[PDB]
Design an enzyme around this catalytic site. Structure first.
Site, PDB file in Angstrom:
ATOM      1  N   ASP A  88       0.834  -1.192   0.000  1.00 11.32           N
ATOM      2  CA  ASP A  88       0.000   0.000   0.000  1.00 11.32           C
ATOM      3  C   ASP A  88       0.866   1.237   0.000  1.00 11.32           C
ATOM      4  OD1 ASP A  88      -2.760   1.354   0.513  1.00 11.32           O
ATOM      5  OD2 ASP A  88      -1.423   2.174   2.053  1.00 11.32           O
ATOM      6  N   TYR A 142       2.974  10.052  -0.036  1.00 13.62           N
ATOM      7  CA  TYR A 142       4.058   9.488   0.752  1.00 13.62           C
ATOM      8  C   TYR A 142       5.410   9.908   0.134  1.00 13.62           C
ATOM      9  CZ  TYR A 142       0.267   6.526   2.799  1.00 13.62           C
ATOM     10  OH  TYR A 142      -0.939   6.087   3.368  1.00 13.62           O
ATOM     11  N   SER A 190      -3.045   2.194  10.739  1.00 13.46           N
ATOM     12  CA  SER A 190      -2.707   2.511  12.157  1.00 13.46           C
ATOM     13  C   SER A 190      -3.356   1.568  13.153  1.00 13.46           C
ATOM     14  CB  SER A 190      -3.038   3.956  12.494  1.00 13.46           C
ATOM     15  OG  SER A 190      -2.169   4.790  11.760  1.00 13.46           O
ATOM     16  N   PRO A 191      -3.171   0.272  12.938  1.00 11.98           N
ATOM     17  CA  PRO A 191      -3.846  -0.716  13.794  1.00 11.98           C
ATOM     18  C   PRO A 191      -3.381  -0.694  15.274  1.00 11.98           C
ATOM     19  CG  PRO A 191      -2.126  -1.768  12.488  1.00 11.98           C
ATOM     20  CD  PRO A 191      -2.242  -0.363  11.985  1.00 11.98           C
TER      21      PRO A 191
HETATM   22 CL   LIG Z   1      -0.046   2.124  14.426  1.00 11.03          CL
END
Ligand SMILES: [Cl-]
Ligand SMILES: [Cl-]
Ligand SMILES: [Cl-]
Ligand SMILES: [Cl-]
Ligand SMILES: [Cl-]
Ligand SMILES: [Cl-]
Ligand SMILES: [Cl-]
Ligand SMILES: [Cl-]
Ligand SMILES: [Cl-]
Ligand SMILES: [Cl-]
Ligand SMILES: [Cl-]
Ligand SMILES: [Cl-]
Ligand code: NA
Ligand code: NA
Ligand code: NA
Ligand code: NA
Ligand code: NA
Ligand code: NA
Lengths: 316, 317, 316, 317, 316, 317
Positions: B45, B50, B201-202
């Site tokens: 991804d 970025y 951002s788990p």
């Molecule tokens: Cl994270």
């Protein structure tokens, strides 16, 4: 003099203040008469308000003057013990609409609203049933309450696609201490022409000034007191009461077509009508907004904090 | 061994863990791609924003000679230049940006193209038409979005269906034990409409690593974070798993979650993240974590979540 | 003998001359009878003509002969003081249509026309309501008055798309001194099969010959006198009166299905019927057109002056 | 600094001032393009009929090497040859003319392609299909029109929506203080349907320059022109701005106006026109100008403009 | 025993022989009774048959037994002197349908057919009006008569596109001496599921045997005599009468659902019923076809002569 | 000077006389093309079956270097080989045959592609989809048909409209003074639906030349032919025109007729045919010709043509 507003994109006008039965036959007739005299001619009720008695009492009070009133009612919440005494499936919608007409003692309802979202009935079926009620002359306009953003949008898109009646009214909780309506439902309402009819505008009696240092999260004392502080400061500048400030603030918000108020008598009605005929200033609104602001949830957060605001600004 | 999941209702499968270039030395990048592919982490991804395009260029160079073994996910529509049209989802920028990404990635197609934010200034009918054309041209296989409101995503899905255009199958969403807002609108919409979550951002921006103990997301209150970490510690004792592994596994048990994006600088870090697979938090362990992480739902979700209106419209979690 | 014309593309025929109530019970019955005897069986009215009294008087006069008449009426202008006593929203359209039926003392209206454009109500809603009235048997044909070109086209496209009834009649101002109908509305009417029912054909009494050397711009004296000069010259050639020339000129114009005239008695009716049974010659029409010509606005101008006429000719 | 505006509802941005080649020496043209681009005037408008194709060729040569920094607007459908099909909007001519313009402009795409007049001889469904195909092929980004009646434009927009084809987003219109007819139909249609105005002859063919004082447009009556100039002179005293700057600024305050096309032979002239930006005529100054320029609206607009039917259908200005 | 056939693709069955009123109260009741007893329970009429008297007489005869009958009627031909006493516009269709119901003394018509094509009314409007009559319960099935191939196809496509009722019956002239139905209308009927109800099956009495050596071209004597010769030869082989052969031939043709016959009494009815219960052989049909063959017009000609038959064969 | 007409409702113009290769020496063919183009006869009609492809090849060679000055009309779908799919309108044959015609014609597009007969074995929805794809690909500008029944053409037009596909704008029809059958169905359909006639065998296969005097079409009865020739002779006396010129001019006065295909071996023959232009048979002369050529209409046209049902559905001629 009463102000009137378009109910979403419908072309139909409602008074800026309405009477929420959320209900002595003589007393009820008197309340209706003082409301009508003041131009408060929107009366809102539901089948579940005192198990049908609110609709019956309203009907009896309006008898003789019903053509001067805009009658708003809600259905689809559980109203009996039977397995089909609830929801928005064709069986219950038809039976409940007819039952409301019988209790209200009238041949039509101005605004019929679904009281909650029934995920068990396809929105296409619900909209078909409502369209049939409108075509039969039993209902003029339709609306909803307590739908998620996605559920309301799904329903509006289906109505348009199928050439059926669309929702024009969202009966929503909105107040200085309950601004969640702003995240999804307000910008949807702006985009799709759905007007807000606002209930519990004083946050269940919390914005009356009486408090000082089922549907809504309980409010943290510290936040309430911060909002009341800001209202007190505005009350000093304006000479207006806390309820009048709360109502005036709501009436300035995008999509708001009517705010439902309570009125036990002439004096209380007059107090509420004191919300009209003046305006909180930009600065006063900004002060109230700052005091009442809460951190927006994801995914609204990066729009509200300015990061993605360029291409998708926030309405307030 | 890598687990694979269907991306929403699309019939397309993605690895349960993907590699988020949101990290990126061409040799170094090739090496990371090598270890990822070896482990079955073949979803990569990226986004135009970025490092101002350098992430896509590096990824393209890293994949060269074996691009066919990868699933390339990219995002566009955020501001990428100073020009008045170097932003948004209007036809001009979507076409230019998609072609620019293809050039940087050094490939003829993108597997999953996602709109990075909602552009209220462009009609969704136009956006969907442009995306449909890119898909038909063979430049894009699947489409998705990120950071849409419930109503905006539904409006788009309904328009796609009505017009016979491609529909969104992936929602690149923030979701974590300390950021459960995805559950209010976006998850039940995803269930209803066959949109799968690709989670970013788990670990809640490094907050669920275990390092902390007693601008997309609200800052988190210390007391809440510590309560969540306490519950994770208790589960860590039972399971023997690390806090990051628990956080990832928890996500993998949630409705709609198709892939979770992780970071991996080397074999050892990749192996740590792969420890999220091959086991499942129990009903009880999930319930314990959910109780610790629970927050008061906003209106209008509140009366459904507290049971009042749940009969006819239950909550998914 | 009365000439009859198709009302746009509807397949329905109207008399070339109609009676415009824009209204003594015996007197009204007599006027209706002399009209019917002459084949003038289109009667046009509106709710706002004398606050409903015109419709009531017409209804009373037609009673006993209504099946021999084509009744045309208009609604949507403000007819009361209430916030919803105006416009084309469902509430007012239904209430006003029923009220007109009551005043006219009949169960159906041949041609129901919206009297002005209501930008506040979606055209999709308006058309749905009208379609329902047609399906219920209350209205046979629908039309409009005073729409912009774009508004009428928007409505026609929506009707077709939704499979609803389309407008077939445009009640328009058109006369030798008021030719604005020609710019947008006429070529739209040609393209989309909408027939003109013409009102104020004498330009509010200005083309009667009495004058010589709310809805329409006042006319400049010099221009009026130039038009009257040309009419006088034609009157010498033809032996016809100025009103007969004005009417005959209108009847030759594209889309014109009927022209509404006034008739207080047999003599006046007979004068107006003198518009029929002869034709202005090409040369006479050209003379009248030259005298009445005005500079077309943008964007019509370069088509009318020939620049873009190749691919988009003007109808007159 | 250049101001930018959305072109109708398209989500595409244009500079508030654009360069109308309706002026056009390859070096001279490159020089003008250079100074325009330096100032942010990067919209260039041309047409096949401008000097029988030479304007498009010169523009193409002037833009070569930097076409990506420009927004190219072109018009076709007016008679461009003696042949029976060298005119109109039928498929044959639209395809041939679009390809010919691309060849002359020396580019693979046109940003805004506009039909120059209404062709009543070709069905709007056919025209829109041809334009949709050109857009899908990548030859055209956005489409527009010029000189359509209200009903013709609405008919086309409705057909586009019904058929799922591209819709017009730009109306190349005459509009000026002395030519306000755009206000009757086309402006309110533009508001309703998201069509932005690109304004040409903003000085009413040199009449609002201040040079005059006491075939697309009606000739203007001297007395009216002088009344308008008087009002402009009064505003010039307050603002210190020139008559052309006032005329341009007035347009920039009107609903739907996205860009105004100006002429610029050199830096000094370009700078004079740029003086229309960076300030705004006040409500009162606009009202004064509007009162002086007001004309009696035709039927059926008259009873709305005079207030009789305004309640339910207000006028935009 | 009566044979029954599907009426096009409708799923509705009609008797193979019907009674064409193209009409003594006792006499009419008797005719109806002998028809019903024989299974001839389709009765066909039209408003124009004796200026409404045929419908009235049929209605009176069927009274008491109407539920045993399939009533077919036609409208849209000029039935009065008024400008709207004709055609298929909404005004006349509604008025004429109600008038037929009144004359027939029943609340519904089984098959309502447009008697001719009205080019002045849009087919979309006509189909909408018919759809409304069907939904109201006044009409079960719809059909047409005397349409061109292109007109019928236009109407069928519009019905399908708009989700309205489609034509299932074509009331057509067809006989051994009038085979024109075969060129366009038959193959359209096959393609689109429209069944033929055949009138003038004896070619206006020309195929009775009485002749030997408004709607249809007059027939050349030489051709008639050639057809009669072939029928005589078949009559010798079969022992059947000329009318029985003519009818039997029709009943074998593609799309034919019913053939309308006349019956003044039991004897005549029995003669016609002699068309049933046997079949012309392949060879006999081929002999009759050869004798009755006419040169097909363009563009049918190169298909009929075999040139383009490969990809588009002829049905007979 | 050549007269030009709109081809149905298409907005495309064709010369009133076209050149039917149904005649076709590369130099000889170039010479004929030269004289035709000089006279404005720039429509050239051919078919795959004309000399087994040689007509298209010769035409292509004759047009090379100037194809852009010609309108090329071609026909396919008749049997062109012995194979089971060397015929009809199914996708396989339509694609193969269109590409084969393009190769033979040595061009990248055909102006008017016509189906030569009705293929009942292929769904009209499929045929129209294939034709729409060819048009969108730029291989064909306009489409048409030949030899369809009224119902078949209407079925196709309705399907095109419903599906948003290209509609037929040209009917290549037999029509002449001795073959007026086009009038019954196809002409009024053409009027209603905007389909223009391109007329072939306008002299009824050489029968209206004046040479005769006292398998697509019925043979004509001598007595009828002679009656028609008598009426033509009478008109020839008034007009001074030749019988072929009268026959052609008569066609040019009929509703829907956009072009009539003629033969021309040389300048002199071309000039004779051009004598059909520049004048018009009078109302009376047309009436005289119509009376002589009139035939009894079949059912169901008969009661409209004889006046019985004419009130609400008049006949076009
Ligand atoms: Cl994270
Ligand atoms: Cl609405
Ligand atoms: Cl409250
Ligand atoms: Cl999918
Ligand atoms: Cl209609
Ligand atoms: Cl008048
Ligand atoms: Cl757009
Ligand atoms: Cl200018
Ligand atoms: Cl059916
Ligand atoms: Cl018969
Ligand atoms: Cl077309
Ligand atoms: Cl010939
Ligand atoms: Na509205
Ligand atoms: Na369900
Ligand atoms: Na018509
Ligand atoms: Na927009
Ligand atoms: Na046309
Ligand atoms: Na087939």
């Amino acid at each position: 003099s009463m102000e009137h507003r378009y109910l979403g994109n419908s072309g139909f006008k409602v008074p800026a203040l309405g009477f929420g039965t959320g209900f002595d036959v003589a007393g009820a007739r008197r309340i209706i008469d003082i409301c009508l005299d003041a131009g408060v001619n929107l009366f809102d009720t539901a089948d579940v308000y005192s198990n049908g008695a609110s609709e019956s009492i309203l009907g009896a009070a309006l008898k003789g003057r019903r053509d001067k009133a805009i009658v708003s009612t809600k259905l689809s919440l559980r109203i009996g013990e039977g397995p089909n005494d609830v929801g928005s499936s064709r069986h219950h919608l038809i039976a409940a609409t007819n039952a409301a007409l019988q209790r209200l003692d009238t041949d039509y309802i101005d605004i019929l609203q679904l009281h909650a979202f029934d995920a068990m009935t396809p929105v296409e079926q619900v909209l078909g049933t409502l369209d049939d009620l409108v075509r039969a002359g039993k209902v003029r306009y339709i609306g909803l309450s307590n739908f998620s953003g996605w559920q309301l949008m799904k329903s509006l898109a289906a109505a348009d696609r199928l050439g059926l009646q669309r929702y024009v009214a969202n009966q929503t909780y909105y107040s200085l201490i309950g601004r969640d309506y702003e995240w999804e439902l307000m910008p949807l309402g702006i985009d799709q022409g759905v007007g807000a009819i606002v209930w519990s505008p004083l946050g269940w009696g919390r914005l009356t000034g009486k408090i000082r240092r089922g549907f809504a999260p309980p409010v943290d004392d510290e936040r309430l007191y911060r909002v009341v502080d800001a209202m007190d400061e505005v009350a000093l500048e304006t000479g207006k009461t806390l309820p009048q400030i709360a109502l005036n603030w709501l009436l300035q918000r995008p999509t708001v077509a009517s705010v439902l108020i309570g009125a036990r008598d002439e004096e209380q009605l007059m107090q509420n009508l004191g919300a009209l005929g003046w305006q909180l200033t930009t600065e006063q609104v900004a002060r109230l907004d700052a005091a009442s602001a809460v951190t927006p949830p994801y995914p609204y957060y990066p729009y509200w904090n300015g990061q993605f605001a360029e291409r998708s600004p926030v309405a307030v």
